[PDB]
Design a protein around this ligand. Sequence first.
Ligand SMILES: CN(C(=O)[C@@H]1O[C@H](CO)[C@H](O)[C@H](n2cc(-c3cc(F)c(F)c(F)c3)nn2)[C@H]1O)c1cc(Cl)cc(Cl)c1
Length: 138
Amino acid sequence: PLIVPYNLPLPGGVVPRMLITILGTVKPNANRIALDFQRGNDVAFHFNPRFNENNRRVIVCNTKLDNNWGREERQSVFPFESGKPFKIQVLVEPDHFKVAVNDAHLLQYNHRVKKLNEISKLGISGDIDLTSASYTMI
Ligand SMILES: CN(C(=O)[C@@H]1O[C@H](CO)[C@H](O)[C@H](n2cc(-c3cc(F)c(F)c(F)c3)nn2)[C@H]1O)c1cc(Cl)cc(Cl)c1
C-alpha cells in the first residue's frame, strides 16, 4: 500500500498519450477524495469527489492560479461508492485531461494551464486506502 497524502512526480510535466492510473479502495464513511495535478504552487487540474455536499454526491473540478480557485466544473455522475475498490485513469489529451473511473468514461477537463511540461506533480489525498499510482505512454 501507499501512504496518503501521496506525491507522484511527473518528470518534465504531462504530455498527450500519457496515461496515469490510480488504484485504491474508498474508505467506509468517506467524505472526499482529491487528485491535484500541480504546476508549482498552481493546481492545473483538481479532481475532487465529494461524498456529502448538502447530502449529495458530486465531483468538483477546478484550477487554482496564484492561490485563487477559478470557476468550478460540476459532474452529476458519481461512480465512487464508500468502502469499494476503484480505478481512476487520467489520460492526458491535446486539449483536456480525460477521466475514466472503473473503465467507464466520466469527464473531460479542458487545459486552463497551457504549459503541460510544467505540470510536474500529481498529489493524491483523501478518504482512500491507496494501492498504486503510476503512469505509462500509450
Ligand atoms: C467552498 N469552496 C471549496 O470547498 C473549495 O473548492 C475548491 C474547488 O473549487 C477545492 O475543492 C477546495 N479544496 C478541497 C481540498 C481537499 C483537500 C484534501 F486534503 C482532500 F483530501 C480533499 F479531498 C480535498 N482542498 N481544497 C475547497 O476548499 C471554495 C470554492 C471556490 Cl471556487 C473558492 C473558494 Cl475561496 C472556496
